[PDB]
Amino acid sequence: IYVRSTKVLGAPLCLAAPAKYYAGYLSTHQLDGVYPDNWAPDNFHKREFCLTILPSLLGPRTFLLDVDADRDASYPLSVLWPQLRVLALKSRLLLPPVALLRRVVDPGLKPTWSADSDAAFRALRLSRPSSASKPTGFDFSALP
RNA sequence: UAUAUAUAUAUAUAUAUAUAUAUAUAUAUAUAUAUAUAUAUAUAUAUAUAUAUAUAUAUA
Q: How far is the CA of A90 from the C1' of B52 (A)?
């Protein structure tokens, strides 16, 4: 899409032309902000599940994750939480986080077909065998 | 009364000078616009040099 303003929503915003025309018409930080979009695209892959912060029409193949905790007050879309939750509630579309670990998805606890007794379910077994020599030998700000 | 000469005044004509007005041209100054050149600053691109990082190859 071709636009005449920076304040746009829904798609990555990049310059149509080389920077020489926009220079003077725009300033440094403004000219800087579009750089990732100037070469924006990256692929998306067809696995079993895909999480997303982008809302969508709740339906037979779309679910709302319920964590049973207060939202991020600073996160701009937290205001949508009530409307989304009630719509999911009235159609039984909430998913407790534990459901994600099962081989097949179902909203519920203590299902018949699964005893939910596996090392994957036991959160107490926190393990960190892998490594990448990364600068975060530990990130002491992240706490499980 | 007359003639001739000289001086002064007045009128008319012609020439020149000066002042004022109007038109035209040229020169100079000032302002504004446009173009070109040069200098300085900033941004972007390209080339070269130096430094640092990463990857790959070879040696120890």
A: 61
